[PDB]
Amino acid sequence: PEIIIGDLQILPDAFVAKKRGTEVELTHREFELLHHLATHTGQVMTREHLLETVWGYDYFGDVRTVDVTVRRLREKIEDTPSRPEYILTRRGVGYYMKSYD
Amino acid sequence: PEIIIGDLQILPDAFVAKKRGTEVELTHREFELLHHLATHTGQVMTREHLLETVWGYDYFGDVRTVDVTVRRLREKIEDTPSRPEYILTRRGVGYYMKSY
């Protein structure tokens, strides 16, 4: 398995993400979130949905944890986090990975 | 599972490590390495052995990767990395987690 989205390469079996061919140092949960968004490109996901799918069905922590993790992911993979081209917000609804070709 | 070593709490099912009750931001591979050492305390492990057990039996990368990952781990979980109290070196042989 290998997921290519623009300049991102995700190697799920290796738990490795690269941006322009350089490895990005991600936490376990950051990688799991990135991988989930990347295997459902263009699909808007609520914070609640992301909590149960990425943190687990027995995880009842603060939804804010999703926002924190998206911020870290943006700081690590975006050229300009204030203007992301991979991890996008649908205002009022959720997060998604931008679809490319 | 819950592993307690000194000021460290390792929660394997949650992939969470805490130091003095605060979560430590570890990469996936750093956590895997820490968990392995922590479940085999006092056991000295060569870099070659760590590569196969922590990166996998199909991983044929550089042993230097183990040294890098131990350094990162030390920087994140040791109060004083030059004088570690968790992730120890056995000179010439390997790495191990001190038993408590």
From TrEMBL, chain A:
A GO molecular function held by the record: transcription cis-regulatory region binding
Domain OmpR/PhoB-type: 1-99
DNA-binding stretch(es), residue numbering of this chain: 1-99
GO biological process: regulation of DNA-templated transcription
Keyword annotations: Cytoplasm, DNA-binding, Phosphoprotein, Transcription, Transcription regulation, Two-component regulatory system
Major location category of this protein: cytoplasm
Localization per record: Cytoplasm
GO annotations of cellular component type: cytosol; protein-DNA complex
Complex formation: Monomer. Homodimer.
Protein role: Member of the two-component regulatory system WalK/WalR that regulates genes involved in cell wall metabolism. Binds to the promoter region of the transcription factor fabT gene in the fabTH-acp operon in vitro. Inhibits transcription of fabT, probably acting in an unphosphorylated form, thereby playing a role in the regulation of fatty acid biosynthesis. Essential for normal growth in vitro. Required for maintaining normal cellular morphology, acting, at least in part, by regulating peptidoglycan hydrolase pcsB.
Protein known as: Transcriptional regulatory protein WalR
Organism, as annotated: Streptococcus mutans
